[PDB]
Ligand binder design. Structure first.
Ligand code: CLA
Ligand code: CLA
Ligand code: CLA
Ligand code: CLA
Ligand code: CLA
Ligand code: CLA
Ligand code: CLA
Ligand code: LHG
Ligand code: KC2
Ligand code: II0
Ligand code: II0
Lengths: 173, 177, 92
């Protein structure tokens, strides 16, 4: 079965219920552990990686006033290394750690069945109300996050090979 | 279920009775400790911090005539000031604590009398006559005390860093470094 | 007989066995993993751990963190193949 991998049996844990479930688990990593935990991890990685990809492109295009003096010609991980000394990365770490302690509480609730994986009730503009909308926007979120994980991996490793940011690379090659 | 952390369940102890409750206890301190003790601690911290923040702000601009009391920086003032006066304040604060609590200054014994948390009977001018005004004042006191806790924390740490008074530090922000 | 009941952690099951193989509750989080999955994991872990150990046998003063991490797969491969045998004789 397994629509994704047609020559493998459908993963036992994956019943097709969750959004973006094409029965893709060739190595059987869903059998080990709880699928709710893996979905929370996947959505965390999706959101973080797509923020990261958009941030890489946006840093390549624009930089805030006065950052050029601090970072020089640094791009990507070089910017990281440069601003760890300055203290920016430390402040980001402090605040993200606060949010992540509260996300720890959220994950403990999820494992107990109270919370749906990846649901933090963050909908200020109120986009997802039409249950239909949320159902589409969930699929779009998962797909875009996966594409973004791959895209950020590609961006970082292209920087490793060449030393050029994503769009600066794309312009000249 | 919480109203503050919408993605977390409402703390069982917090049920909307005490003023200032928005269901904010993500770490479950209320289940482990007495809520009345926690509220007494909260209001005491807020009151001390309110007084402290106003103290720093007034100190940096208004000074006593003596040279030992002419430091705009609060942190530096603590050490420039005579130690005897600081210890006198310590002892007087201790006496006030003892008397106000009634010598029942423990977790087990403080609320044996049954007094409501945060109520030490200090209302000289009698501003709590009107019950509705009293409820508004209670919420305002809680909010302002929390704000003062955070604000004085910021003041003291910015005094450590900048080495200047609160508003001097605010107006002397180094935009070019 | 008057001893207080012994407290045990949550979700504590009975793992005692007199069968040919334990009950696969012994493998915990990996109880639902396939025997073929355990076999492939054990072989891969053995190869990678042996390689990363050989890359560190003449230990230098600056060993590679990834090689140190991967060297822990040789001990891991043993448990993996024990789990493979357990899971082959329990129906999977
Ligand atoms: C994975 C996410 C991520 C991470 C780890 C970083 C990390 C960094 N960014 Mg940022 N950045 C991100 C996403 C991210 N960015 C995104 C999505 C954008 C587009 C708006 C930017 C745009 C941006 C610029 C223009 C600059 C940085 C810079 C930096 C560096 C210093 C911090 C700073 O000034 O940020 C500033 C970033 C912001 C104020 C925007 C953050 C918006 C958040 C992520 C979204 C919040 C959504 C909200 C809840 C709704 C640091 C390496 C500086 C640098 O050194 O560049 C080389 C810099 O000049 N970033
Ligand atoms: C969807 C995501 C994505 C995208 C759009 C790209 C895009 C790119 N990557 Mg890749 N990359 C990705 C994910 C992605 N990557 C990930 C996840 C990783 C981590 C392993 C990498 C690691 C990586 C490296 C290490 C390098 C690239 C390079 C490149 C560039 C040239 C690759 C090439 O010609 O391949 C050719 C591909 C083929 C010939 C296969 C096609 C076969 C046909 C269909 C038959 C290109 C901009 C190269 C680059 O920038 O060189 C300077 C490069 O060296 N990428
Ligand atoms: C020491 C001061 C103090 C104390 C004793 C309390 C006590 C209380 N607050 Mg809280 N509160 C405080 C400060 C304090 N508050 C401040 C400064 C704010 C403003 C943000 C609030 C805002 C607030 C709200 C909005 C609400 C409460 C409520 C409550 C009650 C239930 C929650 C609880 O158990 O909290 C106990 C909490 C503690 C004892 C604090 C523990 C601190 C840990 C151990 C370390 C903290 C480190 C650091 C400051 C955190 C940042 C780290 C960073 C570097 C990453 C309880 C009576 C709820 C209520 O009214 O219920 C009746 C409620 O709705 N509080
Ligand atoms: C409750 C917190 C608090 C603490 C711990 C201190 C501590 C201090 N204050 Mg005081 N101060 C406070 C609140 C506080 N103040 C408030 C609310 C005000 C405004 C009425 C002042 C106004 C003030 C002045 C004008 C001066 C001090 C000064 C001092 C120092 C010497 C003691 C003194 O003369 O106090 C005097 C205390 C009062 C007049 C108010 C006490 C009632 C609460 C000492 C570090 C002296 C100093 O060294 O300044 C740098 C000084 O000249 N304070
Ligand atoms: C109980 C009565 C009492 C007595 C006998 C004293 C006596 C004294 N105080 Mg005072 N003091 C009192 C109450 C008292 N204080 C109270 C209620 C407070 C507020 C908590 C202070 C806070 C205070 C400070 C902060 C300082 C004094 C200081 C002094 C000394 C010089 C001022 C003076 O002549 O008076 C003197 C030994 C000064 C000194 O140098 O003391 C050693 C000094 O710096 N006092
Ligand atoms: C020296 C005498 C003295 C005495 C007897 C006490 C006694 C007390 N203080 Mg402390 N306190 C003192 C000085 C003293 N204080 C001073 C000088 C300050 C600085 C202004 C404070 C600031 C302070 C705060 C902010 C709090 C206490 C609290 C308490 C109570 C619990 C203390 C404990 O061990 O837990 C208890 C009534 C806590 C309380 O009331 O918990 C309900 C509490 O939150 N005290
Ligand atoms: C409500 C209370 C309060 C207020 C009004 C302030 C205000 C200030 N703090 Mg902060 N501070 C506070 C609480 C507060 N603090 C607390 C509780 C702590 C923990 C101890 C600190 C620790 C702290 C440090 C260590 C420093 C400051 C500094 C500052 C100044 C610059 C901060 C800044 O622009 O960050 C820049 C970032 C932003 C404005 C982004 C805000 C986040 C989003 C976008 C909103 C500013 C006057 C700085 C200062 O004075 O430098 C000399 C500084 O270094 N504060
Ligand atoms: C080694 C050092 C360990 C000491 C850390 C002690 C911190 C205790 C902190 C602690 O738990 O105190 C909290 C306690 C109030 O808690 P409750 O109101 O739950 O009462 C405590 C007991 O009555 C119940 O456990 O404070 C007091 O009783 C006042 C004395 C302090
Ligand atoms: C709009 C919001 C904004 C953001 C989000 C932001 C973020 C960061 C970060 C990120 C973590 C760093 C590391 C950084 C660093 C510096 N900023 Mg900057 N900055 C913003 C705004 C302004 C303005 C208005 C000015 C300014 C400046 C400087 C100088 C001075 C260098 C020097 O003069 O030697 C340095 C070193 C001043 C300047 O010189 O700008 C010509 C100045 O006026 N920034 N800035
Ligand atoms: C949810 C929510 C909200 C929200 C929100 C927000 C802020 C949502 C933000 C969403 C974002 C930032 C999504 C970003 C997706 C990025 C992707 C898919 C990148 C792919 C890159 C690729 C494939 C690539 C590449 C590349 C590679 C690898 C090689 C490189 O040389 C270059 C190249 C480009 C070719 C709002 C605010 C509306 C409120 C609402 O109430 C709640
Ligand atoms: C008991 C009682 C009574 C009473 C009374 C009394 C005396 C009540 C007194 C109340 C007071 C003094 C309240 C003070 C609140 C101060 C706050 C919230 C400060 C926040 C500061 C912040 C956020 C800040 C900051 C800053 C930071 C961190 C860094 C700085 O560089 C910059 C900046 C300054 C911006 C009366 C007499 C009516 C009788 C009645 O029967 C009941």
């Amino acid at each position: 079965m397994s629509p994704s991998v047609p020559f493998l049996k459908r993963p036992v844990a994956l019943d097709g219920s969750m959004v973006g479930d094409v029965g893709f688990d060739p190595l059987g990593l869903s059998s080990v552990g709880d699928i709710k935990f893996l979905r929370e991890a996947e959505l965390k990685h999706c959101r973080l990686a797509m923020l990261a990809a958009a941030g890489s492109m946006a840093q390549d295009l624009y930089t805030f006033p006065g950052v050029d003096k601090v970072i020089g010609d640094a791009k990507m991980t070089a910017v990281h290394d440069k601003l760890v000394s300055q203290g920016a990365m430390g402040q980001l770490l402090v605040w993200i750690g606060f949010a992540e302690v509260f996300a720890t509480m959220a994950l403990f609730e999820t494992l107990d069945g109270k919370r749906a994986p990846g649901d933090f009730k963050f909908d200020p503009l109120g986009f997802g109300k039409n249950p239909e909308a949320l159902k589409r926007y969930q699929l779009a979120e998962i797909k875009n996050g996966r594409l973004a994980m791959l895209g950020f991996g590609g961006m970082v490793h292209g920087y490793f090979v060449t030393g050029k940011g994503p769009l600066e690379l794309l312009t000249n090659f | 279920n919480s109203a503050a952390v919408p993605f977390l369940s409402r703390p069982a102890a917090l049920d909307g009775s005490m003023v200032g409750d928005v269901g904010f206890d993500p770490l479950g301190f209320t289940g482990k400790y007495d809520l009345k003790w926690l509220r007494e601690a909260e209001l005491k911290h807020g009151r001390v911090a309110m007084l402290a923040s106003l103290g720093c702000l007034v100190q940096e601009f208004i000074h006593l005539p003596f040279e030992a009391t002419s430091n705009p920086v609060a942190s530096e003032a603590f050490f420039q000031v005579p130690s005897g006066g600081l210890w006198q304040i310590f002892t007087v604060i201790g006496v006030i604590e003892h008397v106000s609590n009634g010598f029942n200054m423990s977790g087990s014994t403080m609320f044996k009398s049954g007094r409501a948390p945060g109520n030490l009977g200090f209302d000289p001018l009698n501003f709590g006559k009107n019950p509705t005004a009293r409820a508004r004042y209670e919420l305002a006191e809680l909010k302002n005390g929390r704000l003062a806790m955070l604000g004085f924390a910021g003041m003291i740490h910015g005094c450590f860093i900048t080495g200047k008074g609160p508003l001097a530090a605010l107006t002397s922000l180094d935009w070019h470094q | 007989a008057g001893y207080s009941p012994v407290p045990s952690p949550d979700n504590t099951k009975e793992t005692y066995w007199e069968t040919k193989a334990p009950s696969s509750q012994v493998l915990g989080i990996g109880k639902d993993v396939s025997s073929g999955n355990y076999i492939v994991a054990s072989v891969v872990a053995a190869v990678v751990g042996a390689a990363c150990t050989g890359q560190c046998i003449p230990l230098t003063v600056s060993p590679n963190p990834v090689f140190i991490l991967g060297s822990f797969l040789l001990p891991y491969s043993w448990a993996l193949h024990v789990a493979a045998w357990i899971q082959r004789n329990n129906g999977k």
